[PDB]
Structures are given as structure tokens and as C-alpha cells.
Amino acid sequence: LKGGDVVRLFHAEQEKFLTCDEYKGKLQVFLRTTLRQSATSATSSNALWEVEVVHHDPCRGGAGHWNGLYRFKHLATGNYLAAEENPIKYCLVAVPHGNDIASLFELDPTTLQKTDSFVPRNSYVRLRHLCTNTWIQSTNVPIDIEEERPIRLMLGTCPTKEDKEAFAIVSVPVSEIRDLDFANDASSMLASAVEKLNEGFISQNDRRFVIQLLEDLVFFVSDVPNNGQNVLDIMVTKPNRERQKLMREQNILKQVFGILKAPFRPLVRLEELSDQKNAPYQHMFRLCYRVLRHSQEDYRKNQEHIAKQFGMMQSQIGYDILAEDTITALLHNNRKLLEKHITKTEVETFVSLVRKNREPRFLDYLSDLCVSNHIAIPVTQELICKCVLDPKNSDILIRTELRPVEEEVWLTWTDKNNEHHEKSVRQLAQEARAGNAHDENVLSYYRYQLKLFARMCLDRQYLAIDEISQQLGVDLIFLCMADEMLPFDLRASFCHLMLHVHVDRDPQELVTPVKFARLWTEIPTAITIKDYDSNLNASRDDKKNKFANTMEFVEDYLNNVVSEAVPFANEEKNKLTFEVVSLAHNLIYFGFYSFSELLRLTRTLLGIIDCDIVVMETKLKILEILQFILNVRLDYRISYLLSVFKKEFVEVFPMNMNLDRIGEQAEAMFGSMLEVDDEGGRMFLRVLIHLTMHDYAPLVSGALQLLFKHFSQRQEAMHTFKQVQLLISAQDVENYKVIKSELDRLRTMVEKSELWVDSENYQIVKGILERLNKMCGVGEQMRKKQQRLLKNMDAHKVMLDLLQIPYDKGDAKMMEILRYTHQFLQKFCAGNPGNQALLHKHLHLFLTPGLLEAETMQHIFLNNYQLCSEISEPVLQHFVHLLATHGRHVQYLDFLHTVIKAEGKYVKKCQDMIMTELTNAGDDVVVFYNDKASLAHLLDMMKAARDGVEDHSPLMYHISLVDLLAACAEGKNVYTEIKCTSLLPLEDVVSVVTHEDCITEVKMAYVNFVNHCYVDTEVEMKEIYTSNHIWTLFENFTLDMARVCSKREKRVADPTLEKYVLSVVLDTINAFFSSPFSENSTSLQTHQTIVVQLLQSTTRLLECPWLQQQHKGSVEACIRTLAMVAKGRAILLPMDLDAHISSMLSSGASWDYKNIIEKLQDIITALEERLKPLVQAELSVLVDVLHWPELLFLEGSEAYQRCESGGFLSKLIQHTKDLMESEEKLCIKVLRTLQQMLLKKTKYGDRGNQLRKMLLQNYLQNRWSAIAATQCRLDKEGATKLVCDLITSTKNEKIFQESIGLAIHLLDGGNTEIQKSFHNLMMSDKKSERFFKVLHDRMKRAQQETKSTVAVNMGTSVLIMQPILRFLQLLCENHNRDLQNFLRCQNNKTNYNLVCETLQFLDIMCGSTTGGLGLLGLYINEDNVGLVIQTLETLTEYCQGPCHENQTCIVTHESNGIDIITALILNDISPLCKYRMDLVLQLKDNASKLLLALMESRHDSENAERILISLRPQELVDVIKKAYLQEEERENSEVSPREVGHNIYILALQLSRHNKQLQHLLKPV
Ligand SMILES: O=P(O)(O)O[C@@H]1[C@H](O)[C@H](O)[C@@H](OP(=O)(O)O)[C@H](OP(=O)(O)O)[C@H]1O
């Protein structure tokens, strides 16, 4: 730490970064809040603080000292942070100079420091104000209370010193300060330009200098040096987000906006920009706009800043300023901002300017505006549709017609002169070929207009598709496409237009390839490839006729592509290839192609891609087509197996099964005709591997997915058939038919949303919704069957689109329909985990500011503990934000109430998040009436609702809030208990309860509140146990009990009061008297009458007949507790009451539907058992395929060289790292596949070996030492770095487990090369600290969980420790001194001692001091014995070699784990010995080995003495003698008591060298 250096000071308590900013035109120093997930992630150059050290000479700075005076300086402003009097005695405020003693501050180290040495960097400091002799502190109150969502936190001063009030130093890159200084310079130049603008005078040379400044700013913003190209044309692939943020905070964008605005404010005029005088001004505006476009690229915050300036963009539009392109970029970047910005007048302005210019670029701007992220925006598309289809704008659009002249096409276009021309399309194309500029321009304009029409019709917007279809016909488009005379680009534009207008329309609908449900009657007696398609062939034949010619066009075009030697050589041909492939994909997905045609098309599509953005996109689309065709093959196989089952059922029972025959048949289908390619499956593999080698990330991901699926055909088909459902019941079949018809009708209506949204359609769909609500069914079993049928139907998707349909608040009929739809979704999710997961998939739609949607979300999350565990803090933030904004009703609170508890289980993190969010929201959300006036208002409302309370009354809302707080209180959660106790005092509850008139529901809520907030407290609060308000509440409880009993005696009673006394009151009293903490209180002697009267009231409650049997039993338990209390609490029972209490003590002392279904289940089971090994063989084939990729490719090829160099495996590893975040399942599968590659080969039986042989022969031509060689190959390809990076940065438990498993498999066998690679990576890389931190933190958490479990008396945290310890042992295997010493001290800034952590883990698992005492048998059980053995083995591996430092550490550690290690040998471990003696023997042997390793080569006697102190000699000798006798009792096992005793004897001798008594005892007879 030195003066003149800058660091960031972070406050741990506030979890905020100190920043200084000009909030209200005046600089304020504060603790800013950040919405970013990581608090440290959010940082600011303004937040940067420069440290200055006071020294004798003002110029001299020297280096900082803890005692030396420190001054902090806001970097951007340069003003020193200072403490000044606050109107919290003093409040921090910046000062211009350090001359004033206000800036001076004193720093106190949080941790001990060496004398007054120089302050270490990145060290915690305690701030204080030496000037005023006070200590600085942070306050929760914000410095910007006025603004919404205040981020700035005020900082005050206190005389006392607080350890919590300390700030941590954080290093700052010099580049950040250099960028801030250069940004201040850039602001200075911008201010010089602004000064010239304000003066209204700028020389020509000065304006040229401004242009040069803009050019330099362009270079800096791009972060790219000049390439000789125009700064306006400057290109940057990815902007620098840090630089963009710096610009935004510096207001350089604001300066540029002001510079653009001022000339037109005149100095310059937009019309005059055409004049040569203001042409340089126009160029300067252009530079500004280009810089803005580069600045705001892919940054929501920069786009937000520009949004406030969007108006000046609108005004500037219509002139040559490139504002069109900049606006299009920003608007495409953000859609929501586009929704705010869009307005019909801007669409009209675009129309007017594009008409005036008559240029294709303006149309291109609109085309870009229409679509974003390849997804159309409905509102903007509708506005543009109206504007374009307006008859007024007919002139701009080019009209087209077809005339015989066997037919030809002519186009008519209008000039700016308003002259109309008409000409043949072929003649235009030929003139463009000749080179006529006018004809080429009109053809390009027409192409752009065609693309504009397709863009309008994007995402099936019928409103304009109708008119566009009226104008353009299918035959015309087909003729234009087929014609070869026209240019390739125009042919491709026709392809796009056809696809977007006609092929995608209402009559066509997407087809799901595999149908889970089937009809038992429909099941064919026999099935072939033709018969499978025959089921829907008729509809296929009818639909084909419309596009039949286009199908042939597609087929012949793809045939031409495959015929061509070079598939994607020509760019112009590639342009049309993309469109044709996309059209084929769309047709296939809509289902026009038959299955045989799809199988034929697979060969061509794969051959095209068999050994630039457009080519990659085409290959991706081909992959998608292959995916769909494989999905269809799956359903064909399912149908074949179903037909087999039906045929066997018919044969056996005309109305014993030949399962062997059926299995023989099914193995054939699972194993020909159905193959995608005619090469035998080789070509698919080669294409997939080549595409994996390809660079494009989506293409590689898809290729990897298909490659993995290619070798798992059998398992997927078995799973699908297990999911298959058959309809055999007539009633359910009729329901299925009705549901199909109703769903198709509803889906058609939702599709024609535009038609039936503004009639009888509304009533029709209300009726359909009610029909589906009836269809849901009654009864749990019936509901489950109907939910299975619904899942098979996929109606849930149609319902989600119905909800997605746009609407306005005024449409009450539509809101009714939405309510019905929500009820139907509720019925779908009712007690169905699968349906609940499906809803979770699309929950993003459900997240809306609507109470009905919130209730539906509550039902979605109902009773799903896994979903609660994976719940999202952002979702919780959304809910609490809605409550803060409105907090109208109890539904938002009820959602959290449901989240709190699931399956009768609690989640501490969820409860803590709820309470923390409540605290952040503050008193406003948590309404109380504690004050007397608020209590009076509550009393008035309670009196008004005394007869009854509304379901949504504000009193009911407050009650529900209190109930949610009680829900948080449940679970004896000490941490949130603290917040609850601070939240509410017992006195307010006492006042409300003791009020003359209190609502019974309010009383139950408060009794429950006390039941958990105070009785269920994990830690004892002295206040409750010293309060006699409990006895006041108990006399009130007796009054209520008397009221209930007298009511039932009078024959008139209130069920609410009865339940109040029965459940909440009884549970609260029972818990209070059960609490051991309450037993400490001795106020029962003062309130002796009260407690005896409470017992009398409970006895009367039990005696009265109205009490229920369950309530009677609960009351009896409570009365037993009250009796144990009554024995010794200065209370004497009356003798008669004691007679009934003695009676109480005595009481306490006292065609066949089911046949077909079961047969199908049995055949499923039998087939699964039959085919189990074949699945394993098929999976194993992939390991060989990955091992030898070259065999697939032809010998001597370029791809052969690439695979021979190991390209495929290295690319797979690198893409695994790249994709760990994008595709978790794919990453995990790849890691497991690498582990399988590493693992040793194994036989698979006769049938499995036959299958493996056949598969390998078809796919590949034929062309421990092996394990070590494979490990070396993987290490060279880079598995070690992949493992290290995954363990370092992954947040996925599965990914971490798989990474550790891969590390263990790599290092297995103690490979010195892998160990050295790990050491080299650890030493060289800068993240070694991060890796060791991850491992050490995991081990520490495992230790903590083990301690918690021991206190209770097996945890994923403890389970994960086993592979970690195995990994450490394997790293230290073969006595690698470098690794053994590295683990102890990795030589970094922070050193983590994994050896001590392992020893402490052993100690805590064994029980520590209690285990030393000798209760080790109680702690050790069959479950943890393996982990104990592994820990001992790891410690032995650490010690052996020997490593003197490790041995000393283990022997001399403060935990005294050597005592536990010796107690392992000495103790009997009786509970485990009785049942499993082998584990006890193994434990003893490993402990003896560790003890011997500890003293392996130590000549000195310290270690031996320390061991012997714990291990007495006589007991040792007794153990040695006992083992030999135990030999005879030995049962067949690997371990031998004789061998164990021999090892203990060797240890005993080595210890005896030092111990004369042990020597004498060891001497035999
Ligand atoms: O991940 P997203 O959607 O971009 O949102 C980010 C984050 O959620 C905050 O909006 C903001 O942090 P603060 O709340 O600290 O401002 C940050 O901008 P920043 O980079 O200016 O912090 C954003 O980038």
C-alpha cells in the first residue's frame, strides 16, 4: 500500500461497494447497491478510490503505514473523501483538496500486523476520522431516498469502534485508471467542441480537428487499430463492455448527443447539410452516430440511455445521417425498448421517406425493423402491415402479373416521375445480365420488396398474408423458381416468399413424429413400411396436390446438388441451397413427405454434407431434418412392437405367450431397410464426426447429440414403449375422440386469434373450455388416467398458446375464457409431477402481474419439493416486487406460504430468503397496528367485520401476512428466528389478544405465531421465559376453553372458536410445557392458580363429549406433559380434580381390459430384461468409435490426417469446455463417455459379444499398460486442463462429480505422467488458488455437515468427499514428493492445507474427543466405515515416501487425530464387529499401516513417544494376542486376522525400540 495508488474498498456487512457520484448535481459518497448476482462484480471508475500517504515532505509519498494518515480520493472527480458534520454526528462528503484536515483519515488493521510495517495490499482496514476523532460507519438509510429503488447508502460516524465497520482493499488494474484519464481527456475534447457550438463559431480547421477527434474516438471504441478504412465504416466484431460502461458513466454519449443536438438547436440545418457548406457538419453527425452505434452494441444499459434520446433520433431521421442504420441496430438489439419507441407516425415517416427516395436501402431498414432475433414482433408487424397494405402506398410496391404471351410473368413499376412501365421478368433478367444500370436497380428494388413481403408474412400474420396471397399465386412462384434463366438470388427470394406465404399457413400444422397413445383396435394385425404411412396417407394424398410440383422441385434440386462434385463451392448457388433446404425442412416438419420418401431423402441430405454462415446454417438444417426422420423411425418401431403384442394376444386368446418368439422379432426391429443411409450406418457416423470437427458451435452441438443418440437406439425405443399407452375402454376411447376434435377446433380458433379478436366464437370457445373442465374428471384414479391421456394429447401446448393470445383488460368475455383456461391448467397439474414439470418449462409465460396467473403458479408449484429446492431467487424477487408495488391481496403471500413447506418438509434457505426480502422491503410491506392509533383503526375494522370477515378484507390480508411470518417462524430456524424476534414483540400480541373483542381467526393466527416464534425457538430467549404474559395468555386460553365448553353445553357453538381452542391453543400449550427451556422458568409458583386452572380447563375439555377422539388423544398427551409439570410447580391439585386426573393417568397407561393391460406390462418387463445387455454393447461401441475415428474416414484423406493427429478427441474436449454452460446434459454425457473410454474393457456375454462384433464390423473397417497408454493419449489431448477448469469454475454438482471421476480415472494406476501434468498445471496457472479453494471449501462443508449429523445423533456434502479423498490419494500415489509437499503448501498467496483438512475430517467423523474416550463404536457404522477407510488410506499415502513435513503435521496437529488413529486399532468397535467383522479388520489394518508410515524413517523419538502416549503397551500386546486367537473364528474373507496381527506386531516392535516395558512384554515365554 502506497500513496498515489487506487484501490476499491468493499464493505462486508453492507455487501456494497463505496462509490462517489453526482446524484443531484452535487457529488455524494455512498455505498451503492447492485442488482448483479455478484456484489463485487459491479464496480465503477468513479467508485475507484486513490490512497494517499501523509509524509513529512508534501512531494514525498513513501509507502503507506497503518499508523500513517491516509486520504482517499474519488478517481474521476479528484475530490478527496472527507467526513463533515451531519445535520450520526458526521456524514462523509467529498472535498476538493487534501489541505483541509477533513480529508485526513486513520486506518486500523482488522487483523494483527507486524509492528508499524507497510500495509499489505488487499487487506481489511478500519476507517476512522482523525480530524474529529471518530470512526466511520455505514448506515442502511440511502443517500438517494428520493429516487426509486435507492442504490446509494449513506455513511455516518460514531465515537465507538466496531470490528464489523471495516473495508476490504481490492486491486485495480492500471488500465482502468488509464482509461478513466483518457475518458476525461475525451470529455475535454468533447467540451471544446461543445464550447465552439455554444459560441456558434467553429473554424473549418477546427471542425476538421473535431472530425479527427471523432476518428480517434472511433478507433478507441472499436479497440482496433485503423485498417486504412473509413472510420464511419469501422468494424468491430465484439465491443468492449467495460469501455462502453466507462463511456456511459463518463457521459461521453451524453456529450455526443448534445453535440448532435446543438447545431440544429441555427449553426447547422438538416436541409443545409445537402449544401457543401454543411457537408462537413453532416459528416460530423455521421461520425457521432457511428460512434453511438458501436457504443450501444449488445448493451441494454447503453440502449436504455439512448432511449431517453430516442426522440432526437426520430427528429434527425429522414436525412443522410445514418440514423436509420443506428436506430435499426438499437431497436433490433432490444424489443421491449422497440415497443416503447414504436409509433404509427414513425412507420408513416419511413413510408414517406422510402417513397421519396425510391431506394431499396430504406425498405431494408423496415425489413430489419420488423424482425428481431429471427422472431417477429406482433405489434410492430401489425402496424407495418397496415402501413404497407394501405392503398395510398400502392405506388411504391411493384405489381406483378402472369400472361400467356406456356406462360410468362410481367412486372409493372412506377418512377418518381409517376410514369408507369411494364416489362417481362425474363427481359429484366437478361437486361441485368447485359449490365443495364436501371434494370439492375429495379430488379434489386423488386428483390428487396419481395423480402419485405415475406418479412410482413413472417410468423404467420394472416392480416397481410391474405392480401399478399391475393397478389401472388403458387403457380406464379413455382414458375419463377423453376425457371433457370432468372438469377440465383431472385430464385432464392422466390423460395423464401413461397415458404413464408403459402407453405406455412392455417391448413398446414406441425406434426409430432412419435405418438405415445395408440388405439387397440387401430393396432394393425401386420405392419410394413407402406402400411405405417397408409394410416394418414389419404390426408397426405389430399394435401400433397397443392404443392406437389414444389415437392419435385425440391427433390430434383437436391439431386443436382448431390450430383455436383463440389457441394457448396459457389456462393450464388449456396444462397438458393439454403432456401431450398429450409423449404424441405418446413415441408417435412409439416408432414407432407411420406416415411418412405423421408428415408429416400435421408441419403441425399446426408450425401450433401458428406466429405461462412450460409453453409453452416444449411448443414444445421439438414441435421434437424435427420433428427425428425429418426424420430419417425422410432414411432415405426413402436408400432411394429405393438402389432406384435396384439398378434400374440389374438393368437393365444381368440376371445401361454411365446415371449421367446416376440423377443426374437423385437431384436430384429431394434437392430436394414429402416437405416437412414445405404452405407450400413457408416456415412451417418462420418458426417457426424466431420461436423463435430467443424468450428460452428451449434453445428458441433447438434452433431454430438446425434452421435450420442446413434448408439442408443435400443434404450430409447424401450423407454418409449414403456411410456406407450393403449386405448381399449370404449368410454375412454370416446373421450379421446372428443378431446381430439375439441382440441383441433380450439387450436384453429387460437390460430385465427386475429379473426375472433376485436361474437358466437367467444361463446363456442367458452363452451369448449367448460367441456374440457368437465372432461378433467372426478376421483383421483380417474384424474390420473385423464392426465395421462392429456399428456399424450399435448393439449397443454394449445392451452399455453391460448393464454399467450393477446388481449386488453376491457374484454370481460376473454378474461372469463382465461379463467377457464387457468382452471383447466390447474386440473392438468393436479397431483401430477410430470405435468408440473411441463408447466415449469414454460413458467416464464406464467410470470405476470396477474392474480389469476399467480394462483395458477401456486398450483403449479404445489407439492413439489424438488421444484422448491431448485426455486429461483429471481422469481422470489419478482413476487416481492409485486407485493411492494401493490400488495393488494393475499395471493402473492399464499404463493410464498406454499413454497415454504412441501411434502411436510421445510427449506431453511427459502425461509431465510423470504425474511430477508421482507426486511429489505421494510415496514411498509409488513403492515402492523402496534401503535395505539393504528390499533384503534384495526379495532374499528375488526368491529365492522365482527359478524364476519371478507375473503379479501384488508384485515384478512394482514392476518395472512402474519400467517406467512409464522410460516417462516416454523422449523426452529435460529437465524431467521432472530429477525422474527426483532420483528414483533410479545407485548403487541398480548394487547391484541387481551382486547375485549378479538377475532377468533386473529387469535388462532397469533397463537400459532407464538407457537413457532417463541416456543419453537432453537435458542432460548430470556424474555419469553421471564415474561408472565404467557400466564396472562393462559388465563385467556382458559376463558376461551370455558367459552367453547359452555357453548357445546348450551348446544350452540362456533366452529371457528372450537377449532381455535382445539388445534392452535392445544399445540402452543403442549409445546410450551414440552420445551426444556420453559422448565427453567419458576413463575409457575406465582401463577400457581393459573396453571392449575389451565389443567382444570384441559380436563374439562377432555371430559366434555363434544371433543373428538383425535383431539382427545392429543389432549391426553398434552395433559401428560401438564402432569409432569404439575408434580413439582408449587401447585396442589384439589382432591376431586385429582381423582379425575387419576382416571386420566389410567387412560394414559391405557376381451379383458385388465388382462390386456397386464399382459402388455409383462411383455414390456420381459423385453427389457431380454435386451438389457444389448444396450450396454451398443453404448460400448461408441468408446471404440471415439478411440479410432480415422477408420471411418478413407485412408490417406485430409480428414484422415486430421483424425490421425488426434483432432477429433481434442476438439471434443475443447467443445466440452466451451459447452459446459450451454448444454449441461451434453457436457455430462461427454465427460462420462471419456471416463468410459478410460475404463478397462469387459466381456458382455455370448449374445452381447456377437452384437458388439457385428456393430464394430459394420461401423469400422477392421484396421494395465493399455490403460496407461490411453490415459497418456487423453492427457496429451488435454483432459487434465479440462478437468482443472471444470472443477475450478463449474457450479453444477453433476459436472463437478463427473470431473472428479475423470481425474480419478486418469490418475488411476499412479501414472507419473498424469501426476506431473497436474503439478505443472497447478504451478503454472494463476487459478491454482481457485482450484485448491474449491476443494478445501468442499471438504470444510463436509466437515460441518458431519458435525451437524453427529450432534443430531448421509448428506451429499459428505458423499462427495469420497471421490475427493480418492483423487488426493491418487495424486500422491507412488510417493510423489513434489505433489505431497504441494498439497501441504502450494506456494501461493493463500495456502490451503488439504492434509490438515483430511485429518480434521477423520477426527470429526470419528467423534473427536468422545472417540478418543472410546465411544468409537457408536460413531462408526456400516455406512461411514468406507469413508473412514478411504480417509485413513489417503493419510497413509500422504505420509509414506516418507514426507517428514507431512508426518510432523499429522502427529502434531492440534486436533490430536493421532489419538483417534490409535483408538481405531485399540477399540473393539463392537457394534460393527458383531455383524461385519471384515470391515473392522480392514479398519484396524489401515490404521496400523498409517501409524507405521508416521514413524517410517524417523530416527528421533518424538513421533514414537507421541503415538505411545495414546497407545498403551499392555493393551497393544493384548490386541496382538487376541488377533491370533480370532484367526480360528475367521470366516471366508480377503482379510486375515493373522495378517492384521502381524502388522500390529511389526508396529509394536518399532515402538518397542523406544519403550522398555513394551520390549519386555513383547518378549515371549
Ligand atoms: O444481466 P443484465 O440483464 O444485463 O442486467 C444486469 C444487472 O441485472 C443490472 O441491470 C445492472 O447492474 P447494477 O444493478 O449494479 O447497475 C447491470 O448493468 P451494469 O453493468 O451497469 O452494472 C446489467 O447488465
Side-chain angles (χ1 to χ4, degrees), residues 464-496:
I465 291 163
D466 46 1
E467 146 61 56
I468 279 162
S469 90
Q470 296 286 358
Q471 184 176 127
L472 293 319
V474 310
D475 270 272
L476 171 93
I477 301 155
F478 180 70
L479 152 61
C480 309
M481 291 213 278
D483 220 304
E484 269 72 5
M485 319 283 330
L486 330 171
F488 269 17
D489 62 353
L490 157 76
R491 214 212 295 270
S493 50
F494 281 118
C495 285
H496 211 291

Side-chain angles (χ1 to χ4, degrees), residues 162-326:
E162 311 292 295
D163 298 297
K164 84 189 180 295
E165 293 289 358
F167 283 63
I169 293 165
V170 174
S171 288
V172 181
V174 294
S175 298
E176 267 182 0
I177 302 85
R178 292 161 202 296
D179 294 0
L180 171 71
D181 299 359
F182 152 79
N184 196 0
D185 299 356
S187 173
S188 184
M189 340 311 302
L190 289 150
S192 75
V194 163
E195 164 174 60
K196 285 178 286 194
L197 292 171
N198 291 127
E199 292 286 359
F201 141 71
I202 172 154
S203 309
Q204 178 52 64
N205 289 302
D206 285 1
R207 164 167 48 165
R208 177 184 42 61
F209 282 123
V210 163
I211 282 150
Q212 159 60 1
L213 160 73
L214 281 145
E215 147 168 302
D216 303 305
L217 181 79
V218 155
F219 300 143
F220 148 74
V221 163
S222 67
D223 214 306
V224 185
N226 197 2
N227 314 294
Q229 58 85 56
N230 191 0
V231 283
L232 283 41
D233 191 60
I234 194 79
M235 171 283 329
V236 79
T237 57
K238 55 196 298 182
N240 184 300
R241 181 46 43 76
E242 288 81 3
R243 285 188 159 180
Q244 296 171 310
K245 140 187 61 49
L246 167 60
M247 246 81 64
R248 176 178 36 61
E249 61 180 359
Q250 285 274 117
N251 319 299
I252 283 159
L253 289 99
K254 182 191 171 294
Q255 285 243 64
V256 161
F257 276 118
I259 284 155
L260 289 138
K261 220 158 289 198
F264 305 122
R265 219 85 63 68
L267 172 83
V268 185
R269 293 191 159 291
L270 296 153
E271 298 85 1
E272 288 190 303
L273 296 184
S274 178
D275 309 357
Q276 280 289 356
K277 171 53 57 172
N278 302 257
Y281 284 124
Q282 192 173 239
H283 191 292
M284 142 206 92
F285 299 120
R286 209 167 298 190
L287 285 152
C288 302
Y289 257 74
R290 295 311 312 181
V291 168
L292 282 141
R293 199 170 189 224
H294 311 317
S295 296
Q296 64 76 63
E297 260 292 357
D298 325 300
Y299 196 178
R300 47 140 281 192
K301 202 174 164 177
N302 270 54
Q303 293 151 17
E304 281 167 343
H305 170 241
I306 292 163
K308 320 334 301 162
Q309 304 264 9
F310 165 67
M312 77 53 52
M313 249 73 79
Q314 170 186 358
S315 310
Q316 267 212 1
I317 221 60
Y319 301 103
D320 189 2
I321 325 173
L322 279 56
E324 291 83 6
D325 56 67
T326 310

Side-chain angles (χ1 to χ4, degrees), residues 1274-1343:
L1274 263 81
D1275 172 58
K1276 200 144 203 283
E1277 301 330 87
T1280 319
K1281 185 71 164 284
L1282 164 42
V1283 161
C1284 299
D1285 298 348
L1286 287 185
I1287 288 163
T1288 290
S1289 297
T1290 194
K1291 204 63 64 192
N1292 176 316
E1293 75 295 20
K1294 295 188 185 299
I1295 294 175
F1296 176 76
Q1297 291 208 47
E1298 279 329 335
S1299 287
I1300 293 286
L1302 183 60
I1304 292 160
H1305 269 114
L1306 289 154
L1307 289 158
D1308 186 303
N1311 182 281
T1312 311
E1313 311 276 310
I1314 315 306
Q1315 290 174 5
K1316 201 75 195 342
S1317 287
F1318 269 106
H1319 192 231
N1320 296 2
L1321 276 171
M1322 274 161 214
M1323 211 56 258
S1324 73
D1325 203 18
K1326 319 306 302 302
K1327 88 191 194 264
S1328 201
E1329 210 168 28
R1330 307 205 284 128
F1331 179 68
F1332 277 74
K1333 181 165 176 59
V1334 161
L1335 288 185
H1336 173 285
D1337 281 290
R1338 276 177 165 292
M1339 310 219 305
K1340 199 97 186 292
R1341 179 141 161 260
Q1343 283 164 40

Side-chain angles (χ1 to χ4, degrees), residues 956-1204:
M956 173 54 234
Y957 182 60
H958 169 52
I959 292 164
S960 160
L961 164 68
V962 173
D963 286 275
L964 191 56
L965 295 168
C968 318
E970 268 137 1
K972 61 165 289 304
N973 307 120
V974 77
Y975 164 100
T976 178
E977 141 160 36
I978 299 155
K979 327 324 172 206
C980 291
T981 44
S982 57
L983 216 67
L984 199 69
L986 266 170
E987 186 167 359
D988 282 335
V989 178
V990 163
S991 72
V992 54
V993 165
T994 60
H995 181 242
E996 294 181 0
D997 167 15
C998 187
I999 305 304
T1000 299
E1001 279 78 1
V1002 164
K1003 282 221 193 190
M1004 333 168 195
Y1006 276 119
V1007 167
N1008 187 71
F1009 211 60
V1010 172
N1011 208 348
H1012 319 123
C1013 290
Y1014 304 116
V1015 189
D1016 193 28
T1017 54
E1018 176 185 304
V1019 64
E1020 38 270 55
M1021 325 328 296
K1022 300 176 185 177
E1023 308 78 350
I1024 310 142
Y1025 304 119
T1026 58
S1027 273
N1028 309 296
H1029 310 113
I1030 288 97
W1031 314 122
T1032 306
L1033 170 82
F1034 281 4
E1035 57 173 62
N1036 165 59
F1037 280 168
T1038 53
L1039 175 72
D1040 298 303
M1041 278 160 216
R1043 285 165 188 295
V1044 159
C1045 287
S1046 72
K1047 273 171 185 209
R1048 293 298 306 247
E1049 176 175 0
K1050 298 151 182 187
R1051 286 69 51 175
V1052 180
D1054 192 301
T1056 72
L1057 187 84
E1058 230 187 1
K1059 270 52 144 197
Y1060 157 71
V1061 173
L1062 282 160
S1063 301
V1064 293
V1065 172
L1066 296 196
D1067 301 319
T1068 301
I1069 303 157
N1070 189 96
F1072 163 74
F1073 284 111
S1074 84
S1075 167
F1077 308 157
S1078 79
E1079 303 311 296
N1080 296 307
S1081 306
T1082 72
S1083 34
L1084 278 85
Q1085 110 287 21
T1086 59
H1087 306 80
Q1088 60 199 7
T1089 51
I1090 281 73
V1091 292
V1092 167
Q1093 286 153 9
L1094 206 175
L1095 190 82
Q1096 193 287 348
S1097 301
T1098 315
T1099 282
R1100 176 194 176 181
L1101 190 134
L1102 198 71
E1103 284 163 358
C1104 281
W1106 62 259
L1107 192 59
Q1108 309 182 3
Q1109 186 176 0
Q1110 306 169 1
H1111 287 124
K1112 262 188 285 140
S1114 73
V1115 169
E1116 287 180 1
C1118 319
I1119 289 164
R1120 286 148 210 170
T1121 79
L1122 305 203
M1124 330 162 206
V1125 175
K1127 308 313 188 192
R1129 287 295 213 183
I1131 38 182
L1132 314 179
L1133 289 305
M1135 180 22 52
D1136 207 80
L1137 189 80
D1138 203 358
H1140 334 98
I1141 288 157
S1142 303
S1143 86
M1144 142 52 71
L1145 294 166
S1146 179
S1147 306
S1150 299
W1151 302 117
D1152 279 299
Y1153 190 66
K1154 315 316 302 303
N1155 184 22
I1156 301 161
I1157 296 154
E1158 162 169 60
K1159 295 270 176 290
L1160 193 87
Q1161 287 278 0
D1162 302 357
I1163 198 154
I1164 288 150
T1165 304
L1167 289 161
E1168 191 146 310
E1169 309 321 335
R1170 184 134 159 66
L1171 308 179
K1172 201 192 91 83
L1174 307 183
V1175 170
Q1176 315 325 299
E1178 203 188 358
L1179 216 169
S1180 89
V1181 201
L1182 176 75
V1183 153
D1184 310 297
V1185 160
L1186 281 153
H1187 254 297
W1188 292 343
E1190 81 294 356
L1191 300 194
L1192 302 163
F1193 294 71
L1194 170 69
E1195 152 180 10
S1197 296
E1198 180 255 319
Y1200 203 108
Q1201 300 157 59
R1202 195 72 160 295
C1203 279
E1204 151 185 50

Side-chain angles (χ1 to χ4, degrees), residues 32-36 42 149 245 248 299-301:
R32 211 189 62 73
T33 79
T34 176
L35 307 177
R36 299 189 140 273
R149 191 188 64 75
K245 140 187 61 49
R248 176 178 36 61
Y299 196 178
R300 47 140 281 192
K301 202 174 164 177

